[PDB]
C-alpha cells in the first residue's frame, strides 16, 4: 500500500500520536494531585466561576453584581447558594464540570441585594395603511444579587 | 494583570503591525488575511465601534 510522496499522497494536516492510555492516565492522576495540593495549600487568589442561574450562564467573581430578570421570592439581604456552577477558575488552574461541578468541589454564595422593576419597556405594533397601531408598557421584575464568595474544597 | 487602568487600556487597544509576503501568493488570500487584520476581527476584544484595527504591510 506504499504511495510515493506527492502533494496528495498524504493528508495536508500533520499526523498526531495521542499518548498511550495507561501512561496518560498516570499523568492525569499526577496533574489532579498537583492541583489538589495547590487547593489544599491555598495557592490561589481571586476565583471566578461560570454559574448557570435563571436561564443564563454568568461569569462571576467575589463582590460581583448580577441582575436577574425576575423576582426570586427572596427577602432582600437573604443569602443564597448558586448550585449550578459549570466552571471554577483561578490564576493558575481551572476546573470544568461535565457539565456541572460538584457541590463538594465548589460553593458559590450570593445575597439578594435588591428587588426592583425594570425601566418601562415600550412594545409598539404598527402596520402601514391598516389603522393598526398599538402600544403597551411593560416593567419586568428584577433582582440584583451580590456574589459574596466563591470557595473551593480539596475534593479532586 | 495588575496593570494600572490607562496602561491596561492602552495595551488592550494597541494596534499591532503585521507583515505579509505576497511573493507567489494569491491576492485573494492575501486580501482575506489583510482585511481580517485591518478590521481587527482577529482580536477577542473586537467590536465595529472600537476602532481596533491593526496595520498590515504587504511586501
Amino acid at each position: 500500500g506504499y504511495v510515493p510522496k506527492t502533494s496528495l499522497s498524504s493528508p495536508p494536516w500533520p499526523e498526531v500520536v495521542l499518548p498511550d492510555p495507561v501512561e496518560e492516565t498516570r499523568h492525569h492522576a499526577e496533574v489532579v494531585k498537583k492541583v489538589n495540593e495547590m487547593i489544599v495549600t491555598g495557592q490561589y487568589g481571586r476565583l471566578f466561576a461560570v454559574v448557570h442561574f435563571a436561564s443564563r450562564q454568568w461569569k462571576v467573581t467575589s463582590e460581583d453584581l448580577i441582575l436577574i430578570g425576575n423576582e426570586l421570592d427572596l427577602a432582600c439581604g437573604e443569602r443564597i447558594r448558586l448550585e449550578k456552577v459549570l466552571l471554577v477558575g483561578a490564576d493558575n488552574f481551572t476546573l470544568l464540570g461535565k457539565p456541572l461541578l460538584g457541590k463538594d468541589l465548589v460553593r458559590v454564595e450570593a445575597t439578594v441585594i435588591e428587588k426592583t422593576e425594570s425601566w418601562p419597556r415600550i412594545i409598539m405594533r404598527f402596520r402601514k395603511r391598516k389603522n393598526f397601531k398599538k402600544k403597551r408598557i411593560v416593567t419586568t421584575p428584577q433582582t440584583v444579587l451580590r456574589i459574596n464568595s466563591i470557595e473551593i474544597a480539596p475534593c479532586l | 494583570s495588575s496593570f494600572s487602568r490607562a496602561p491596561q487600556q492602552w495595551a488592550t487597544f494597541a494596534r499591532i503591525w503585521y507583515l505579509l509576503d505576497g511573493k507567489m501568493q494569491p491576492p485573494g488570500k492575501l486580501a482575506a488575511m489583510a482585511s481580517i487584520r485591518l478590521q481587527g476581527l482577529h482580536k477577542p476584544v473586537y467590536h465595529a465601534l472600537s476602532d481596533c484595527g491593526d496595520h498590515v504591510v504587504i511586501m
Partner: protein, 82 residues
C-alpha cells in the same frame, strides 16, 4: 510528548480528569518571557489635517469640527463602569 497546543506562548496547559472522570482539571501556569528573548532598553486647516491624518493613519474627515447641534448633543457626563 504530545501537546494539544504549543506551550511557547501564554500558559503551559496540562489537561486532566479526576478519577471518577466527572470533572476536567486544567493546570495552566503562565510562561515568563525568557531574558534571552528581550532587548536592552534604548538610551492652516488643510495642512494641519493632512499632517494629523499622516500621523495617526486616519482620514481627513474625523479631524474636521462638528456643529453646535452635535457638540451639545454629546453627553459630557457619561455613565462610568469599573
Amino acid at each position: 510528548t504530545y501537546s494539544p497546543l504549543p506551550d511557547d506562548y501564554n500558559c503551559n496547559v496540562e489537561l486532566a480528569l479526576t478519577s471518577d472522570g466527572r470533572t476536567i482539571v486544567c493546570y495552566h501556569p503562565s510562561v515568563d518571557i525568557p531574558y534571552e528573548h528581550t532587548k536592552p532598553i534604548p538610551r492652516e486647516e488643510g495642512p494641519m489635517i493632512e499632517q494629523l491624518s499622516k500621523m495617526f493613519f486616519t482620514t481627513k474627515h474625523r479631524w474636521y469640527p462638528h456643529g453646535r447641534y452635535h457638540r451639545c448633543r454629546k453627553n459630557l457626563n457619561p455613565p462610568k463602569d469599573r
